[PDB]
Amino acid sequence: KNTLARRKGRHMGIGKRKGTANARMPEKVTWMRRMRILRRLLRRYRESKKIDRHMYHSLYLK
RNA sequence: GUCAACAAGUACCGUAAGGGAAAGUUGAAAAGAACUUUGAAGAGAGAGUUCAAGAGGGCGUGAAACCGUUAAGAGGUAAACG
RNA sequence: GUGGAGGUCCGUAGCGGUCCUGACGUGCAAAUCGGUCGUCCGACCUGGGUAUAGGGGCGAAAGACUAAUCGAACCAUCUAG
RNA sequence: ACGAGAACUUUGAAGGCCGAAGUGGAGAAGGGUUCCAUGUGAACAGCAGUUGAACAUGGGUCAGUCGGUCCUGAGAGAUGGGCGAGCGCCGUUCCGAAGGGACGGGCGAUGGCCUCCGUUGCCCUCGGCCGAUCGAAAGGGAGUCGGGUUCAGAUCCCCGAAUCCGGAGUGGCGGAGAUGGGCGCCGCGAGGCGUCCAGUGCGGUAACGCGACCGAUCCCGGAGAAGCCGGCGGGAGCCCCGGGGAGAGUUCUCUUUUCUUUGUGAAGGGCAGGGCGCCCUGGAAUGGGUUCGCCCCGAGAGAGGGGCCCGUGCCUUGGAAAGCGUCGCGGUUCCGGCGGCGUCCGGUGAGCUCUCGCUGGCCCUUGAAAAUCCGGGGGAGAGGGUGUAAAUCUCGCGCCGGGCCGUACCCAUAUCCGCAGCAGGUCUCCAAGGUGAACAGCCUCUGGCAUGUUGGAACAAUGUAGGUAAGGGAAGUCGGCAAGCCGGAUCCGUAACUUCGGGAUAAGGAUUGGCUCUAAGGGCUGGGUCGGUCGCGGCCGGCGCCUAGCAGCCGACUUAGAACUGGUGCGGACCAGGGGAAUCCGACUGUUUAAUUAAAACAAAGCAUCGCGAAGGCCCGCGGCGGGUGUUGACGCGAUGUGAUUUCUGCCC
RNA sequence: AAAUGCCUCGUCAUCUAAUUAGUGACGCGCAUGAAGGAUGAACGAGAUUCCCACUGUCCCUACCUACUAUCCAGCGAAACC
RNA sequence: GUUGGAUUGUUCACCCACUAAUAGGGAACGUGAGCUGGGUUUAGACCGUCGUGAGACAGGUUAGUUUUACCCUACUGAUGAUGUGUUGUUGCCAUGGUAAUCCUGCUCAGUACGAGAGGAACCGCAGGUUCAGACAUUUGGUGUAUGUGCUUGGCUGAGGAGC
RNA sequence: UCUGGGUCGGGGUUUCGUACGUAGCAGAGCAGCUCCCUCGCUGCGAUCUAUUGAAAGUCAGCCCUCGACACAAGGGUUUGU
Ligand SMILES: O=C(c1ccc(-n2nnc3cccnc32)cc1)N(c1ncccc1Cl)[C@@H]1CCCNC1
Ligand SMILES: [Mg+2]
Ligand SMILES: [Mg+2]
Ligand SMILES: [Mg+2]
Ligand SMILES: [Mg+2]
Ligand SMILES: [Mg+2]
Ligand SMILES: [Mg+2]
Ligand SMILES: [Mg+2]
Ligand SMILES: [Mg+2]
Ligand SMILES: [Mg+2]
Ligand SMILES: [Mg+2]
Ligand SMILES: [Mg+2]
Ligand SMILES: [Mg+2]
Ligand SMILES: [Mg+2]
Ligand SMILES: [Mg+2]
Ligand SMILES: [Mg+2]
Ligand SMILES: [Mg+2]
Ligand SMILES: [Mg+2]
Ligand SMILES: [Mg+2]
Ligand SMILES: [Mg+2]
Ligand SMILES: [Mg+2]
Ligand SMILES: [Mg+2]
Ligand SMILES: [Mg+2]
Ligand SMILES: [Mg+2]
Ligand SMILES: [Mg+2]
Ligand SMILES: [Mg+2]
Ligand SMILES: [Mg+2]
Ligand SMILES: [Mg+2]
Ligand SMILES: [Mg+2]
Ligand SMILES: [Mg+2]
Ligand SMILES: [Mg+2]
Ligand SMILES: [Mg+2]
Ligand SMILES: [Mg+2]
Ligand SMILES: [Mg+2]
Ligand SMILES: [Mg+2]
Ligand SMILES: [Mg+2]
Ligand SMILES: [Mg+2]
Ligand SMILES: [Mg+2]
Ligand SMILES: [Mg+2]
Ligand SMILES: [Mg+2]
Ligand SMILES: [Mg+2]
Numbered sequence A: 001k002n003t004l005a006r007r008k009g010r011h012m013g014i015g016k017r018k019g020t021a022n023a024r025m026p027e028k029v030t031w032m033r034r035m036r037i038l039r040r041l042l043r044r045y046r047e048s049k050k051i052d053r054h055m056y057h058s059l060y061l062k
Numbered sequence B: 001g002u003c004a005a006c007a008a009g010u011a012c013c014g015u016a017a018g019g020g021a022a023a024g025u026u027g028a029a030a031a032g033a034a035c036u037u038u039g040a041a042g043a044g045a046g047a048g049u050u051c052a053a054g055a056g057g058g059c060g061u062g063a064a065a066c067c068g069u070u071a072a073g074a075g076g077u078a079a080a081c082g
Numbered sequence C: 001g002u003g004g005a006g007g008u009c010c011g012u013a014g015c016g017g018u019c020c021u022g023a024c025g026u027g028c029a030a031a032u033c034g035g036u037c038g039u040c041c042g043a044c045c046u047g048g049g050u051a052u053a054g055g056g057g058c059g060a061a062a063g064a065c066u067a068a069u070c071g072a073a074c075c076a077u078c079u080a081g
Numbered sequence D: 001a002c003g004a005g006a007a008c009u010u011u012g013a014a015g016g017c018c019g020a021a022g023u024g025g026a027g028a029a030g031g032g033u034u035c036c037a038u039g040u041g042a043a044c045a046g047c048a049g050u051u052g053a054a055c056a057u058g059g060g061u062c063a064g065u066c067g068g069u070c071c072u073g074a075g076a077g078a079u080g081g082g083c084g085a086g087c088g089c090c091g092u093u094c095c096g097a098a099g100g101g102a103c104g105g106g107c108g109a110u111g112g113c114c115u116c117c118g119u120u121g122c123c124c125u126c127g128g129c130c131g132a133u134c135g136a137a138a139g140g141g142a143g144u145c146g147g148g149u150u151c152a153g154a155u156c157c158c159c160g161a162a163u164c165c166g167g168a169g170u171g172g173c174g175g176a177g178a179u180g181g182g183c184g185c186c187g188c189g190a191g192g193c194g195u196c197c198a199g200u201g202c203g204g205u206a207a208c209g210c211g212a213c214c215g216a217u218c219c220c221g222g223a224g225a226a227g228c229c230g231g232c233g234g235g236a237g238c239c240c241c242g243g244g245g246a247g248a249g250u251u252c253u254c255u256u257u258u259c260u261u262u263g264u265g266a267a268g269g270g271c272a273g274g275g276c277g278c279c280c281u282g283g284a285a286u287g288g289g290u291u292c293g294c295c296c297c298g299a300g301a302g303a304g305g306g307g308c309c310c311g312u313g314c315c316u317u318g319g320a321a322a323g324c325g326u327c328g329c330g331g332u333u334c335c336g337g338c339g340g341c342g343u344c345c346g347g348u349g350a351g352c353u354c355u356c357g358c359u360g361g362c363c364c365u366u367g368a369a370a371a372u373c374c375g376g377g378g379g380a381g382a383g384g385g386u387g388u389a390a391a392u393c394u395c396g397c398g399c400c401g402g403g404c405c406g407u408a409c410c411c412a413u414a415u416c417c418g419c420a421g422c423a424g425g426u427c428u429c430c431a432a433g434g435u436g437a438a439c440a441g442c443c444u445c446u447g448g449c450a451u452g453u454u455g456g457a458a459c460a461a462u463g464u465a466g467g468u469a470a471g472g473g474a475a476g477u478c479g480g481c482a483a484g485c486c487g488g489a490u491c492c493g494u495a496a497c498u499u500c501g502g503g504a505u506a507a508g509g510a511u512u513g514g515c516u517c518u519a520a521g522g523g524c525u526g527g528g529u530c531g532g533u534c535g536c537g538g539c540c541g542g543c544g545c546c547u548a549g550c551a552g553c554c555g556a557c558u559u560a561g562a563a564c565u566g567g568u569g570c571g572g573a574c575c576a577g578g579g580g581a582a583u584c585c586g587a588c589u590g591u592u593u594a595a596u597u598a599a600a601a602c603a604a605a606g607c608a609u610c611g612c613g614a615a616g617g618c619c620c621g622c623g624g625c626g627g628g629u630g631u632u633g634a635c636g637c638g639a640u641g642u643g644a645u646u647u648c649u650g651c652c653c
Numbered sequence E: 001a002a003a004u005g006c007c008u009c010g011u012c013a014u015c016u017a018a019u020u021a022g023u024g025a026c027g028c029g030c031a032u033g034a035a036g037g038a039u040g041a042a043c044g045a046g047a048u049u050c051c052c053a054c055u056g057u058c059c060c061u062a063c064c065u066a067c068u069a070u071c072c073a074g075c076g077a078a079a080c081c
Numbered sequence F: 001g002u003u004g005g006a007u008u009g010u011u012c013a014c015c016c017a018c019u020a021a022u023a024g025g026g027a028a029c030g031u032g033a034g035c036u037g038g039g040u041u042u043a044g045a046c047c048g049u050c051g052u053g054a055g056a057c058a059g060g061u062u063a064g065u066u067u068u069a070c071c072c073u074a075c076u077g078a079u080g081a082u083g084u085g086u087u088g089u090u091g092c093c094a095u096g097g098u099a100a101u102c103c104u105g106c107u108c109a110g111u112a113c114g115a116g117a118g119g120a121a122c123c124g125c126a127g128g129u130u131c132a133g134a135c136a137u138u139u140g141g142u143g144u145a146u147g148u149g150c151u152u153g154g155c156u157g158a159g160g161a162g163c
Numbered sequence G: 001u002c003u004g005g006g007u008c009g010g011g012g013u014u015u016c017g018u019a020c021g022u023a024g025c026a027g028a029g030c031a032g033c034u035c036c037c038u039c040g041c042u043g044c045g046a047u048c049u050a051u052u053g054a055a056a057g058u059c060a061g062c063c064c065u066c067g068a069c070a071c072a073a074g075g076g077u078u079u080g081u
């Protein structure tokens, strides 16, 4: 019943956290997660012919 | 007296080289205390063996230091002594 | 932004041993214990197997260590020096 | 309860501690019977014991597959040789006539199912594991798993599934090799009979596949056989989250509740999944593909299509007959009894621990060897004359064997060492829930234990360990010694100085609870317009514009903001830097007197000098032209001083 | 006037109410000095001086807790003489 | 009675401040099984001077284990012992110990005294210092009454009640 | 003994700060029910308010009880002019 209340947001707080925000969730993992989301929507638009091979490749570097 | 009169180069010690003790005696004969009784037993009390258990299984004799007990005497200049 | 280097830093287990000149000091112990401390990817820590033996060994060097023994180990003898 | 006797034994109940880096479960060393029963109750276990690791009496360790055994490593070590008065010791390929083998060739005596054909003697050919031998219970090293079982043993016994190696003269059976063509009569023909010629397998463009699929001396190769660290990814085990059961717990009220439990070995066969600098088609600039990071491409990208490897996961055989959970019924009541029922369906992840893989980083550091095994190249040779044939077979099945030694238990606040049941020391494997960054500390579950060699009663001094303290705030003291303060995290803000890296968590400040909300951050599905119209579903196409994306379902965790709210409390315990200004010294990290000195000492990088071109330099050695450096060669070895950088290093021979 | 300066508590400045301390200067320096001299970040369980915060370190002691001592049952040493 | 401090290991010294005063000594240079370990101060190390050197320095610097009482006595407390028949109650005092101390203010008096500047004292009163003996109404400390609230992490299915 | 002193209980004192339940048209808000409602009525919800200076403790070394309940002439060892 505390995991039920933590997932609603309670007890999380700024005085209930004791490790650094990078230790609490690594920003490499945030970057690694975000890159995979934005790279597979680009591969999915290319094979669905929304974007061509040229708009894909310039977007892929942004 | 050989370290060793005895289950002695033994037990034990040290990684090893090596080091290295202690310990003899019931009685003539086991006759090594049957039996009864108290105790859970060890231990006792009787009884018995023997010349002897003031010889009872590390037991011949059994000193002293030291200790217990009884008896007698004494005790404020620590005892002791001439 | 990503990336993740370093005899890098705080800090575990380990390894070590600073201070209290704390406890102990006929001890739990012929060197221990408590707290605080040093280091903690490196000249790191460790098991087993090997090599080096006494005026010799081995030493990031204190004359340190070489079986509780070290400015020359231990054992027996010369020796009742 | 037993007992003469209970603070200490055992059983139950409670209350607690270790708290998965255990006070848990197993081992290596080392011990040596301590293991396990029963009995005792003297001694010993520093109180006591009805207890014991004591005493007595018995019992207990089962192997082709687990180790040893085998292999080589650092190294040890004989022989030849050399030295040595000598016991010997030097040396390990060096001052050696160091192969004792081999299919075959051939001469053979011939013993023989003497047709022969296994043996054998010499000859011919062939030939460097060029160093005997030893060295690992953590290296290398074929092949065993599940279930049951004892007072004490089990991967060893039993039951059941396997499996490697070795062998089989009298070959044990299949299959492969290997049974085709041409011609000529005959057969209406399907097929016979004759004759001639083949036949040491076949498929795929390819990578490669197929059950076998000749072949020696020799030769080339592979496996064995390789560091550390980082980052991802796959798979498992555990954890977790929804449900479905079976059984317990609570039930004063609430709780569709809380807990426990909810299997499939090896070896086969298949299929997911993972990897591939593997193949083929084709030819890329408006460069494209792509990872967290990279990286890749005319020496062939993207895209299509294949191939191989791994497959520890899932399915199947094993296999439910076993096990487990419940519920019952019996006796031989000390039976691997008997029966029912079940052993289900999902979801998550920067989780943890193993493992597999990919790809990087670092190195004046490049991270064993060998037994063993395999593949290829080569072709000496061998096989039979068209037969239900031969040599041969790394294919399937069958048959026989696997000896010797270890195997109990302890593995440590009581089995080991420390004179002892000694707070010391002593190498590893597994590792749950909560909090949290965390194998931190704290609390709990599994498992374990009885407070560490005595109890009782008191609450004096002095201690030892821990706390607090008005008002001052180092005045104490040789010295702020000791203690205290500080502390996490978020948001701000950070000087001098500097080798530009640092200083730095500088310093300094704010914030932190609970509750109720709010935003933001993803994943899987379906965008199909008219039946044009019959094999309530499709068969080929008129018939249409999601195209600024909708719609359904599902899913974690985290960040920011706001309202309310409390006696201003909020990192509430635990965890958890006091800071500043200077001077001296050593650059730093590292090291050091085990048991009074951790430092400014030693080390060190950098700098500088010296010797030496091998009959050499330095050094060992009783001795040998014996050793070490040296598997070396001046960018090297050897001998010294100083001690990073910066800046300098004067004069005297 | 340095970890090197006898004289020496050197002289002047600063720091304090007060400084044989510390820092900055000065220097015929008892007896500084160049592979060692002079520096300089970072680092240090190294030595030293002051400031801020903090405090029983003190003025000046007090009180509370655990284990002792203390008493009892059991057990029972040694140094020394 | 003879103090609180800076520097120094200091004894001494010197200075600041207070005070009625900040006198001098002794007791195994009183006192370490009382402490501390700052000076000296074994083994480490650095510098200067000396020495060919190992080393030395009555020179500077830094680091460096402080053991035992349970015996007899003394001392401090605690029982007790000998007498008087036993036993109790109420008392006496031999002897030994002995403790209080100093200063301000007011007043005297701005008087005596003195040219002036300055400037007392006794009586009296009001307080304080140092010491001594107590005590806890009060204020302060303590606080495990484990009193009563609050609160973190965990645990009993939650609530409640608790650990 | 005009008993007695104990153990509970009661009262006084005092310490802390308002218990549990229940109720509330108190509550930041959120979720629901719509024949309802004519702006409802069920939930969730820290906190608040009333019941409530409540609740809990209070001699063990606090005070006073005369309520309840028991128990108390019982033992053991010595002492003579
Ligand atoms: O334990 C002792 C200890 C003390 C005294 C003796 N003595 N002295 N005289 C003695 C006469 C007879 C017997 N013993 C005797 C023995 C040893 N320590 C110790 N203390 C100081 C110097 C040396 C040592 Cl070793 C240790 C060190 C570690 C920390 N704890 C203390
Ligand atoms: Mg006689
Ligand atoms: Mg006689
Ligand atoms: Mg005789
Ligand atoms: Mg005799
Ligand atoms: Mg005679
Ligand atoms: Mg006799
Ligand atoms: Mg007498
Ligand atoms: Mg000490
Ligand atoms: Mg002591
Ligand atoms: Mg102990
Ligand atoms: Mg020396
Ligand atoms: Mg000598
Ligand atoms: Mg003589
Ligand atoms: Mg604990
Ligand atoms: Mg075990
Ligand atoms: Mg164990
Ligand atoms: Mg005993
Ligand atoms: Mg046993
Ligand atoms: Mg061998
Ligand atoms: Mg075993
Ligand atoms: Mg023990
Ligand atoms: Mg205890
Ligand atoms: Mg106990
Ligand atoms: Mg205070
Ligand atoms: Mg001072
Ligand atoms: Mg002072
Ligand atoms: Mg300190
Ligand atoms: Mg700084
Ligand atoms: Mg250093
Ligand atoms: Mg030492
Ligand atoms: Mg030390
Ligand atoms: Mg030189
Ligand atoms: Mg000359
Ligand atoms: Mg200077
Ligand atoms: Mg000072
Ligand atoms: Mg100066
Ligand atoms: Mg000179
Ligand atoms: Mg020069
Ligand atoms: Mg003395
Ligand atoms: Mg002393």
Ligand SMILES: [Mg+2]
Pocket (backbone or CB within 6 Å): none
């Ligand atoms: Mg000293």
Ligand SMILES: [Mg+2]
Pocket (backbone or CB within 6 Å): none
């Ligand atoms: Mg010295």
Ligand SMILES: [Mg+2]
Pocket (backbone or CB within 6 Å): none
């Ligand atoms: Mg010099």
Ligand SMILES: [Mg+2]
Pocket (backbone or CB within 6 Å): none
């Ligand atoms: Mg000289």
Ligand SMILES: [Mg+2]
Pocket (backbone or CB within 6 Å): none
């Ligand atoms: Mg509650």
